[PDB]
PDB file of C-alpha atoms in Angstrom:
ATOM      1  CA  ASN Z   1      12.164  -4.337   5.777  1.00 48.20           C
ATOM      2  CA  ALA Z   2       8.508  -5.380   5.444  1.00 46.99           C
ATOM      3  CA  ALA Z   3       9.463  -9.048   5.038  1.00 46.15           C
ATOM      4  CA  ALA Z   4      11.520  -9.022   8.239  1.00 42.38           C
ATOM      5  CA  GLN Z   5       8.708  -7.266  10.111  1.00 43.99           C
ATOM      6  CA  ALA Z   6       6.169  -9.836   8.894  1.00 43.42           C
ATOM      7  CA  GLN Z   7       8.474 -12.686   9.928  1.00 40.92           C
ATOM      8  CA  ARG Z   8       8.886 -11.178  13.402  1.00 38.45           C
ATOM      9  CA  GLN Z   9       5.105 -10.796  13.690  1.00 36.02           C
ATOM     10  CA  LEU Z  10       4.629 -14.462  12.740  1.00 35.92           C
ATOM     11  CA  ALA Z  11       7.243 -15.584  15.269  1.00 36.01           C
ATOM     12  CA  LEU Z  12       5.484 -13.655  18.056  1.00 32.84           C
ATOM     13  CA  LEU Z  13       2.063 -14.929  16.982  1.00 36.49           C
ATOM     14  CA  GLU Z  14       3.332 -18.521  17.002  1.00 37.17           C
ATOM     15  CA  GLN Z  15       4.846 -18.197  20.461  1.00 38.26           C
ATOM     16  CA  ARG Z  16       1.832 -16.592  22.133  1.00 37.36           C
ATOM     17  CA  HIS Z  17      -0.529 -19.284  20.800  1.00 36.00           C
ATOM     18  CA  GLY Z  18       1.765 -22.220  21.586  1.00 35.64           C
ATOM     19  CA  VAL Z  19       1.622 -23.573  18.036  1.00 35.76           C
ATOM     20  CA  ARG Z  20       3.937 -24.606  15.233  1.00 34.67           C
ATOM     21  CA  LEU Z  21       3.091 -22.270  12.355  1.00 34.01           C
ATOM     22  CA  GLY Z  22       4.253 -22.545   8.742  1.00 34.92           C
ATOM     23  CA  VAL Z  23       3.647 -19.713   6.292  1.00 34.22           C
ATOM     24  CA  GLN Z  24       4.768 -18.782   2.789  1.00 35.30           C
ATOM     25  CA  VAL Z  25       3.602 -15.546   1.140  1.00 32.80           C
ATOM     26  CA  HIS Z  26       4.628 -14.377  -2.342  1.00 30.88           C
ATOM     27  CA  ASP Z  27       3.272 -11.132  -3.793  1.00 30.24           C
ATOM     28  CA  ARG Z  28       3.334 -11.330  -7.586  1.00 31.66           C
ATOM     29  CA  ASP Z  29       3.046  -7.546  -7.908  1.00 28.04           C
ATOM     30  CA  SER Z  30       6.240  -6.592  -6.051  1.00 28.86           C
ATOM     31  CA  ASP Z  31       7.683 -10.118  -6.492  1.00 29.87           C
ATOM     32  CA  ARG Z  32       8.544 -10.061  -2.770  1.00 28.01           C
ATOM     33  CA  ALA Z  33       8.077 -12.905  -0.308  1.00 29.55           C
ATOM     34  CA  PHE Z  34       8.210 -13.758   3.375  1.00 27.73           C
ATOM     35  CA  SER Z  35       8.064 -17.035   5.231  1.00 29.49           C
ATOM     36  CA  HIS Z  36       8.179 -18.877   8.540  1.00 29.55           C
ATOM     37  CA  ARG Z  37       9.055 -22.588   8.745  1.00 33.02           C
ATOM     38  CA  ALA Z  38       8.375 -22.755   5.027  1.00 35.55           C
ATOM     39  CA  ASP Z  39      10.579 -25.849   4.503  1.00 33.04           C
ATOM     40  CA  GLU Z  40       9.140 -27.841   7.430  1.00 33.08           C
ATOM     41  CA  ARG Z  41       6.492 -30.526   6.996  1.00 31.88           C
ATOM     42  CA  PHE Z  42       2.888 -29.961   8.076  1.00 29.79           C
ATOM     43  CA  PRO Z  43      -0.199 -32.185   7.704  1.00 28.93           C
ATOM     44  CA  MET Z  44      -2.199 -31.203   4.620  1.00 29.12           C
ATOM     45  CA  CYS Z  45      -5.604 -32.301   5.882  1.00 31.41           C
ATOM     46  CA  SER Z  46      -8.256 -31.178   3.371  1.00 30.86           C
ATOM     47  CA  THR Z  47      -5.859 -28.782   1.631  1.00 32.50           C
ATOM     48  CA  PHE Z  48      -4.941 -31.749  -0.596  1.00 30.58           C
ATOM     49  CA  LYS Z  49      -8.271 -31.232  -2.390  1.00 31.75           C
ATOM     50  CA  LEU Z  50      -6.849 -28.223  -4.229  1.00 35.49           C
ATOM     51  CA  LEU Z  51      -4.173 -30.465  -5.766  1.00 36.52           C
ATOM     52  CA  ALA Z  52      -6.676 -33.246  -6.444  1.00 32.35           C
ATOM     53  CA  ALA Z  53      -8.903 -30.869  -8.385  1.00 32.34           C
ATOM     54  CA  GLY Z  54      -5.848 -29.573 -10.241  1.00 35.22           C
ATOM     55  CA  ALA Z  55      -4.904 -33.131 -11.212  1.00 35.89           C
ATOM     56  CA  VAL Z  56      -8.428 -33.818 -12.477  1.00 34.84           C
ATOM     57  CA  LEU Z  57      -8.404 -30.588 -14.486  1.00 36.06           C
ATOM     58  CA  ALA Z  58      -5.005 -31.467 -15.964  1.00 36.39           C
ATOM     59  CA  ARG Z  59      -6.401 -34.851 -17.013  1.00 38.75           C
ATOM     60  CA  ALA Z  60      -9.379 -33.085 -18.601  1.00 41.24           C
ATOM     61  CA  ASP Z  61      -6.974 -30.730 -20.431  1.00 36.71           C
ATOM     62  CA  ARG Z  62      -5.152 -33.690 -22.003  1.00 35.88           C
ATOM     63  CA  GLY Z  63      -8.291 -35.737 -22.696  1.00 34.11           C
ATOM     64  CA  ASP Z  64      -7.465 -38.386 -20.093  1.00 32.41           C
ATOM     65  CA  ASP Z  65     -10.773 -37.713 -18.356  1.00 32.01           C
ATOM     66  CA  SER Z  66     -13.854 -35.551 -18.827  1.00 30.81           C
ATOM     67  CA  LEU Z  67     -15.454 -33.105 -16.408  1.00 30.42           C
ATOM     68  CA  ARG Z  68     -18.844 -34.243 -17.722  1.00 30.24           C
ATOM     69  CA  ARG Z  69     -18.296 -37.932 -16.894  1.00 30.69           C
ATOM     70  CA  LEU Z  70     -20.952 -39.269 -14.524  1.00 35.62           C
ATOM     71  CA  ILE Z  71     -19.447 -41.034 -11.496  1.00 36.67           C
ATOM     72  CA  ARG Z  72     -21.593 -43.611  -9.699  1.00 36.11           C
ATOM     73  CA  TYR Z  73     -20.916 -44.478  -6.064  1.00 38.42           C
ATOM     74  CA  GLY Z  74     -22.642 -46.269  -3.231  1.00 39.79           C
ATOM     75  CA  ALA Z  75     -23.955 -45.545   0.229  1.00 39.57           C
ATOM     76  CA  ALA Z  76     -21.049 -47.744   1.348  1.00 40.22           C
ATOM     77  CA  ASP Z  77     -18.574 -45.137   0.003  1.00 40.04           C
ATOM     78  CA  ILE Z  78     -19.882 -42.202   2.053  1.00 37.71           C
ATOM     79  CA  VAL Z  79     -17.549 -40.859   4.745  1.00 39.55           C
ATOM     80  CA  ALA Z  80     -18.077 -38.125   7.332  1.00 42.10           C
ATOM     81  CA  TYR Z  81     -18.840 -34.561   6.173  1.00 41.44           C
ATOM     82  CA  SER Z  82     -20.335 -35.254   2.765  1.00 41.18           C
ATOM     83  CA  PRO Z  83     -23.043 -32.580   2.493  1.00 40.46           C
ATOM     84  CA  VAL Z  84     -23.187 -32.677  -1.328  1.00 39.76           C
ATOM     85  CA  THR Z  85     -22.332 -36.274  -2.205  1.00 40.00           C
ATOM     86  CA  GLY Z  86     -24.514 -37.818   0.500  1.00 40.73           C
ATOM     87  CA  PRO Z  87     -27.879 -36.611  -0.816  1.00 37.58           C
ATOM     88  CA  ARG Z  88     -26.899 -37.263  -4.462  1.00 36.05           C
ATOM     89  CA  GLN Z  89     -25.552 -40.801  -3.975  1.00 35.34           C
ATOM     90  CA  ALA Z  90     -28.278 -42.719  -5.827  1.00 32.19           C
ATOM     91  CA  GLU Z  91     -27.993 -40.562  -8.969  1.00 29.39           C
ATOM     92  CA  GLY Z  92     -24.225 -40.070  -8.939  1.00 28.92           C
ATOM     93  CA  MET Z  93     -22.392 -36.850  -9.737  1.00 27.34           C
ATOM     94  CA  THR Z  94     -20.260 -35.616 -12.605  1.00 28.46           C
ATOM     95  CA  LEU Z  95     -16.534 -35.122 -12.219  1.00 31.15           C
ATOM     96  CA  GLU Z  96     -16.961 -31.337 -12.338  1.00 30.05           C
ATOM     97  CA  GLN Z  97     -19.681 -31.484  -9.662  1.00 32.90           C
ATOM     98  CA  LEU Z  98     -17.323 -33.567  -7.506  1.00 30.25           C
ATOM     99  CA  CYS Z  99     -14.445 -31.127  -8.017  1.00 31.29           C
ATOM    100  CA  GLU Z 100     -16.725 -28.283  -6.964  1.00 30.36           C
ATOM    101  CA  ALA Z 101     -17.998 -30.206  -3.937  1.00 33.78           C
ATOM    102  CA  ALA Z 102     -14.461 -31.088  -2.839  1.00 32.01           C
ATOM    103  CA  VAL Z 103     -12.943 -27.631  -3.364  1.00 29.38           C
ATOM    104  CA  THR Z 104     -15.801 -25.252  -2.603  1.00 27.64           C
ATOM    105  CA  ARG Z 105     -17.474 -27.282   0.169  1.00 25.59           C
ATOM    106  CA  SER Z 106     -14.659 -29.616   1.357  1.00 26.21           C
ATOM    107  CA  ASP Z 107     -16.953 -32.612   0.821  1.00 27.00           C
ATOM    108  CA  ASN Z 108     -14.922 -35.612   1.990  1.00 26.04           C
ATOM    109  CA  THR Z 109     -16.531 -38.316  -0.151  1.00 28.23           C
ATOM    110  CA  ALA Z 110     -16.040 -36.012  -3.135  1.00 27.02           C
ATOM    111  CA  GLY Z 111     -12.344 -35.822  -2.295  1.00 26.40           C
ATOM    112  CA  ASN Z 112     -12.115 -39.610  -2.121  1.00 28.88           C
ATOM    113  CA  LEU Z 113     -13.946 -39.966  -5.432  1.00 26.52           C
ATOM    114  CA  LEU Z 114     -11.475 -37.572  -7.069  1.00 28.08           C
ATOM    115  CA  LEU Z 115      -8.601 -39.641  -5.680  1.00 25.54           C
ATOM    116  CA  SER Z 116     -10.205 -42.785  -7.114  1.00 27.22           C
ATOM    117  CA  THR Z 117      -9.855 -41.305 -10.619  1.00 29.06           C
ATOM    118  CA  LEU Z 118      -6.163 -40.451 -10.069  1.00 29.48           C
ATOM    119  CA  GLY Z 119      -4.888 -43.810  -8.874  1.00 30.31           C
ATOM    120  CA  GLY Z 120      -5.409 -43.013  -5.216  1.00 28.78           C
ATOM    121  CA  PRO Z 121      -3.012 -41.208  -2.895  1.00 27.61           C
ATOM    122  CA  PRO Z 122      -0.028 -42.472  -4.959  1.00 27.39           C
ATOM    123  CA  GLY Z 123      -1.518 -40.751  -7.993  1.00 25.92           C
ATOM    124  CA  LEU Z 124      -1.784 -37.452  -6.159  1.00 26.64           C
ATOM    125  CA  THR Z 125       1.815 -37.728  -4.973  1.00 23.54           C
ATOM    126  CA  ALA Z 126       2.941 -38.442  -8.543  1.00 25.21           C
ATOM    127  CA  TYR Z 127       0.975 -35.410  -9.731  1.00 22.89           C
ATOM    128  CA  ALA Z 128       2.808 -33.213  -7.207  1.00 20.44           C
ATOM    129  CA  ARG Z 129       6.157 -34.567  -8.403  1.00 20.41           C
ATOM    130  CA  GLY Z 130       5.173 -33.623 -11.962  1.00 20.28           C
ATOM    131  CA  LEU Z 131       4.603 -30.048 -10.734  1.00 24.95           C
ATOM    132  CA  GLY Z 132       8.182 -29.953  -9.425  1.00 25.91           C
ATOM    133  CA  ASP Z 133       7.115 -30.503  -5.804  1.00 25.37           C
ATOM    134  CA  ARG Z 134       9.591 -32.944  -4.235  1.00 24.47           C
ATOM    135  CA  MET Z 135       8.071 -32.841  -0.728  1.00 24.25           C
ATOM    136  CA  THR Z 136       4.298 -33.294  -0.762  1.00 24.75           C
ATOM    137  CA  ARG Z 137       2.968 -36.800  -0.243  1.00 22.04           C
ATOM    138  CA  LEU Z 138      -0.528 -38.181   0.152  1.00 22.73           C
ATOM    139  CA  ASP Z 139      -0.773 -41.643   1.674  1.00 21.69           C
ATOM    140  CA  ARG Z 140      -4.293 -42.056   3.050  1.00 20.19           C
ATOM    141  CA  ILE Z 141      -7.856 -41.146   2.060  1.00 18.38           C
ATOM    142  CA  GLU Z 142     -10.506 -39.167   3.937  1.00 17.40           C
ATOM    143  CA  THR Z 143     -10.818 -39.003   6.872  1.00 20.79           C
ATOM    144  CA  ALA Z 144      -7.794 -41.104   7.863  1.00 20.92           C
ATOM    145  CA  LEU Z 145      -5.408 -38.516   6.383  1.00 17.64           C
ATOM    146  CA  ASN Z 146      -6.431 -35.992   9.081  1.00 16.14           C
ATOM    147  CA  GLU Z 147      -4.586 -37.770  11.933  1.00 12.96           C
ATOM    148  CA  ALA Z 148      -1.876 -35.072  11.824  1.00 11.87           C
ATOM    149  CA  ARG Z 149       0.482 -36.802  14.244  1.00  8.78           C
ATOM    150  CA  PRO Z 150       3.676 -34.797  14.905  1.00  8.77           C
ATOM    151  CA  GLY Z 151       6.659 -36.315  13.106  1.00  9.23           C
ATOM    152  CA  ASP Z 152       4.541 -38.493  10.804  1.00  8.42           C
ATOM    153  CA  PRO Z 153       5.526 -37.977   7.131  1.00 10.24           C
ATOM    154  CA  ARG Z 154       2.227 -39.267   5.788  1.00  6.79           C
ATOM    155  CA  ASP Z 155      -0.130 -36.791   4.175  1.00  5.32           C
ATOM    156  CA  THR Z 156       2.232 -33.813   4.550  1.00  6.73           C
ATOM    157  CA  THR Z 157       3.417 -30.819   2.542  1.00  6.10           C
ATOM    158  CA  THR Z 158       5.595 -27.804   3.238  1.00  4.98           C
ATOM    159  CA  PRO Z 159       4.336 -24.215   3.065  1.00  4.44           C
ATOM    160  CA  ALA Z 160       6.854 -23.392   0.329  1.00  4.99           C
ATOM    161  CA  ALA Z 161       6.100 -26.503  -1.714  1.00  5.21           C
ATOM    162  CA  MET Z 162       2.367 -25.874  -1.593  1.00  6.45           C
ATOM    163  CA  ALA Z 163       2.816 -22.191  -2.485  1.00  4.40           C
ATOM    164  CA  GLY Z 164       4.756 -23.353  -5.546  1.00  6.66           C
ATOM    165  CA  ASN Z 165       1.838 -25.577  -6.523  1.00  8.85           C
ATOM    166  CA  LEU Z 166      -0.606 -22.683  -6.097  1.00  9.46           C
ATOM    167  CA  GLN Z 167       1.578 -20.618  -8.421  1.00  7.06           C
ATOM    168  CA  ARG Z 168       1.769 -23.307 -11.119  1.00  7.08           C
ATOM    169  CA  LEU Z 169      -1.941 -24.173 -10.997  1.00  4.59           C
ATOM    170  CA  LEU Z 170      -3.611 -20.769 -10.633  1.00  6.42           C
ATOM    171  CA  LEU Z 171      -1.081 -18.352 -12.127  1.00  8.90           C
ATOM    172  CA  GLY Z 172       1.302 -20.434 -14.266  1.00 10.80           C
ATOM    173  CA  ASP Z 173       0.949 -22.967 -17.041  1.00  9.49           C
ATOM    174  CA  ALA Z 174       0.181 -26.261 -15.275  1.00  8.92           C
ATOM    175  CA  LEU Z 175      -3.422 -25.863 -16.489  1.00  7.94           C
ATOM    176  CA  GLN Z 176      -4.959 -24.471 -19.654  1.00 12.25           C
ATOM    177  CA  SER Z 177      -6.431 -20.996 -19.224  1.00 12.71           C
ATOM    178  CA  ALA Z 178     -10.022 -22.269 -19.046  1.00 11.99           C
ATOM    179  CA  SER Z 179      -9.177 -24.882 -16.383  1.00 13.47           C
ATOM    180  CA  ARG Z 180      -7.162 -22.352 -14.393  1.00  9.31           C
ATOM    181  CA  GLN Z 181     -10.297 -20.191 -14.318  1.00  9.94           C
ATOM    182  CA  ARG Z 182     -12.503 -23.085 -13.151  1.00  5.49           C
ATOM    183  CA  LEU Z 183     -10.188 -23.808 -10.237  1.00  7.34           C
ATOM    184  CA  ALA Z 184     -10.034 -20.135  -9.252  1.00  8.21           C
ATOM    185  CA  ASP Z 185     -13.836 -19.953  -9.392  1.00  9.35           C
ATOM    186  CA  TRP Z 186     -14.300 -22.994  -7.137  1.00 11.03           C
ATOM    187  CA  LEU Z 187     -11.830 -21.574  -4.609  1.00 12.47           C
ATOM    188  CA  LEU Z 188     -13.333 -18.074  -4.676  1.00 16.71           C
ATOM    189  CA  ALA Z 189     -16.800 -19.531  -4.024  1.00 13.87           C
ATOM    190  CA  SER Z 190     -15.745 -21.233  -0.786  1.00 15.26           C
ATOM    191  CA  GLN Z 191     -17.115 -20.113   2.598  1.00 11.47           C
ATOM    192  CA  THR Z 192     -15.350 -22.695   4.764  1.00 11.20           C
ATOM    193  CA  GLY Z 193     -12.549 -20.220   5.547  1.00  9.85           C
ATOM    194  CA  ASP Z 194     -14.711 -17.187   6.333  1.00  8.71           C
ATOM    195  CA  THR Z 195     -13.173 -16.895   9.826  1.00  6.62           C
ATOM    196  CA  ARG Z 196      -9.626 -17.805   8.714  1.00  6.15           C
ATOM    197  CA  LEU Z 197      -7.394 -15.926   6.209  1.00  4.56           C
ATOM    198  CA  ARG Z 198     -10.344 -14.145   4.575  1.00  3.05           C
ATOM    199  CA  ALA Z 199     -11.298 -12.562   7.915  1.00  3.58           C
ATOM    200  CA  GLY Z 200      -7.955 -10.739   7.945  1.00  6.92           C
ATOM    201  CA  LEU Z 201      -8.197  -9.165   4.503  1.00  7.95           C
ATOM    202  CA  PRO Z 202      -8.880  -5.510   3.720  1.00  7.72           C
ATOM    203  CA  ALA Z 203     -12.252  -4.589   2.269  1.00 11.09           C
ATOM    204  CA  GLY Z 204     -12.567  -5.386  -1.413  1.00 10.90           C
ATOM    205  CA  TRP Z 205      -9.820  -7.999  -1.366  1.00 10.36           C
ATOM    206  CA  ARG Z 206     -10.743 -11.567  -2.280  1.00 12.96           C
ATOM    207  CA  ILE Z 207      -9.195 -14.931  -1.502  1.00 13.58           C
ATOM    208  CA  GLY Z 208      -9.747 -18.221  -3.258  1.00 17.10           C
ATOM    209  CA  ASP Z 209      -8.749 -20.613  -0.515  1.00 15.55           C
ATOM    210  CA  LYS Z 210      -8.872 -24.212   0.636  1.00 16.59           C
ATOM    211  CA  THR Z 211      -9.094 -24.950   4.359  1.00 17.38           C
ATOM    212  CA  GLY Z 212      -8.280 -28.042   6.367  1.00 14.67           C
ATOM    213  CA  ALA Z 213      -8.340 -29.244   9.941  1.00 11.93           C
ATOM    214  CA  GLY Z 214      -7.169 -32.328  11.735  1.00 13.04           C
ATOM    215  CA  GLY Z 215      -5.872 -33.902  14.893  1.00 12.08           C
ATOM    216  CA  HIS Z 216      -3.243 -32.501  17.229  1.00 14.99           C
ATOM    217  CA  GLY Z 217      -4.652 -28.996  16.933  1.00 12.19           C
ATOM    218  CA  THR Z 218      -4.109 -28.739  13.160  1.00  8.46           C
ATOM    219  CA  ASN Z 219      -5.846 -26.027  11.135  1.00  8.05           C
ATOM    220  CA  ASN Z 220      -4.766 -24.841   7.681  1.00  7.79           C
ATOM    221  CA  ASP Z 221      -5.704 -22.359   4.966  1.00  6.86           C
ATOM    222  CA  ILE Z 222      -4.013 -21.978   1.561  1.00  6.55           C
ATOM    223  CA  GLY Z 223      -4.914 -19.988  -1.510  1.00  4.19           C
ATOM    224  CA  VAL Z 224      -4.506 -17.016  -3.792  1.00  5.60           C
ATOM    225  CA  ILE Z 225      -5.410 -13.487  -2.737  1.00  3.54           C
ATOM    226  CA  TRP Z 226      -6.647 -11.065  -5.379  1.00  2.00           C
ATOM    227  CA  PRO Z 227      -6.255  -7.590  -3.830  1.00  2.00           C
ATOM    228  CA  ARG Z 228      -8.570  -4.720  -4.647  1.00  2.00           C
ATOM    229  CA  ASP Z 229      -5.790  -3.040  -6.672  1.00  6.36           C
ATOM    230  CA  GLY Z 230      -2.835  -5.329  -7.249  1.00  7.51           C
ATOM    231  CA  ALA Z 231      -1.591  -8.544  -8.792  1.00  6.41           C
ATOM    232  CA  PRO Z 232      -2.291 -11.869  -7.036  1.00  6.94           C
ATOM    233  CA  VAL Z 233      -0.605 -12.987  -3.827  1.00  2.25           C
ATOM    234  CA  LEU Z 234       0.141 -16.638  -3.023  1.00  2.00           C
ATOM    235  CA  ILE Z 235      -0.409 -17.649   0.598  1.00  2.00           C
ATOM    236  CA  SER Z 236      -0.004 -20.969   2.404  1.00  2.00           C
ATOM    237  CA  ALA Z 237      -0.696 -21.121   6.146  1.00  2.00           C
ATOM    238  CA  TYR Z 238      -0.355 -24.328   8.155  1.00  2.00           C
ATOM    239  CA  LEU Z 239      -0.916 -24.392  11.911  1.00  2.00           C
ATOM    240  CA  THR Z 240      -0.476 -27.386  14.198  1.00  2.00           C
ATOM    241  CA  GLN Z 241      -0.025 -28.372  17.852  1.00  2.00           C
ATOM    242  CA  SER Z 242      -2.676 -25.965  19.159  1.00  2.00           C
ATOM    243  CA  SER Z 243      -4.174 -26.749  22.563  1.00  2.00           C
ATOM    244  CA  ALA Z 244      -6.933 -24.171  21.994  1.00  2.00           C
ATOM    245  CA  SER Z 245     -10.448 -24.361  20.580  1.00  2.00           C
ATOM    246  CA  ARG Z 246     -11.180 -24.399  16.854  1.00  2.00           C
ATOM    247  CA  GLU Z 247     -12.463 -20.814  16.996  1.00  2.00           C
ATOM    248  CA  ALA Z 248      -9.222 -19.721  18.669  1.00  2.00           C
ATOM    249  CA  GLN Z 249      -7.194 -21.484  15.961  1.00  2.00           C
ATOM    250  CA  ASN Z 250      -9.245 -19.811  13.239  1.00  2.00           C
ATOM    251  CA  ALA Z 251      -8.487 -16.413  14.774  1.00  2.00           C
ATOM    252  CA  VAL Z 252      -4.753 -17.143  14.571  1.00  2.00           C
ATOM    253  CA  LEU Z 253      -5.129 -17.749  10.832  1.00  2.00           C
ATOM    254  CA  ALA Z 254      -7.128 -14.527  10.479  1.00  2.00           C
ATOM    255  CA  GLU Z 255      -4.159 -12.732  12.048  1.00  2.00           C
ATOM    256  CA  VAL Z 256      -1.818 -14.395   9.533  1.00  2.00           C
ATOM    257  CA  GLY Z 257      -4.075 -12.880   6.882  1.00  2.00           C
ATOM    258  CA  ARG Z 258      -3.675  -9.429   8.435  1.00  2.00           C
ATOM    259  CA  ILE Z 259       0.115  -9.823   8.612  1.00  2.00           C
ATOM    260  CA  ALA Z 260       0.234 -10.864   4.955  1.00  2.00           C
ATOM    261  CA  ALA Z 261      -2.075  -8.075   3.784  1.00  2.00           C
ATOM    262  CA  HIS Z 262      -0.014  -5.485   5.631  1.00  2.00           C
ATOM    263  CA  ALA Z 263       3.219  -6.691   4.016  1.00  2.00           C
ATOM    264  CA  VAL Z 264       1.595  -6.491   0.581  1.00  2.00           C
ATOM    265  CA  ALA Z 265       0.389  -2.966   1.344  1.00  2.00           C
ATOM    266  CA  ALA Z 266       3.823  -1.966   2.685  1.00  2.00           C
ATOM    267  CA  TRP Z 267       5.574  -3.246  -0.447  1.00  2.00           C
ATOM    268  CA  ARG Z 268       3.025  -1.278  -2.498  1.00  2.00           C
ATOM    269  CA  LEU Z 269       3.548   1.942  -0.520  1.00  2.00           C
ATOM    270  CA  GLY Z 270       7.326   1.591  -0.400  1.00  2.00           C
ATOM    271  CA  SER Z 271       7.328   1.615   3.404  1.00  2.00           C
TER     272      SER Z 271
END
């Protein structure tokens, strides 16, 4: 069937690029799924920012925080790759501006500032447990969490666990409808994955995605695909142990996107 063909394609792709690849895809239209290593652990890298923004939105939903709250921070708090938070440091930024910077732009200081409102990495882990995710754990802050050492449990998820979180946050009831829309909008506005999953999608399809990259040849992309004419598709793609360049890694993820889009189309056509 289409799921078996997609799984064979992923196995061949993994072998020819010398990587360890973890993928979960779930098409909400046909309700069908396929996966590869979906129960194995992979380093999250910046993909944690999707969860962090979800946790902030959930707090806003229950009145435990406010998206309009102004957060002050110092030059001493700035870490690498902070294109939004760096220039705004003296004036501060609101919680919603920080969520947008973290999700849409992958701003690292923004991610750390979100974590600071959640009780740190332990707060994000607790949030994941509340979503029914028994695997994901965050232990470090940016950029330490990007080490991505094989075998290290810190700062890891599984493709299946993260796909479940995408479902609850974007498509289910973990967030109120308005907050669900905000998160989708921040993800759909991202460009950081233009050469990753999005590059493999048919014309007119959209993806709201969160990328990440780290040590040991780690490069990830997770999100929700909205096809041109179909219900949403959850996708979580984690790649690690590449010996190749970043551009080569990105092209592997683009091919995962093509494999996923073809399976969705095949389920639609009845192939």
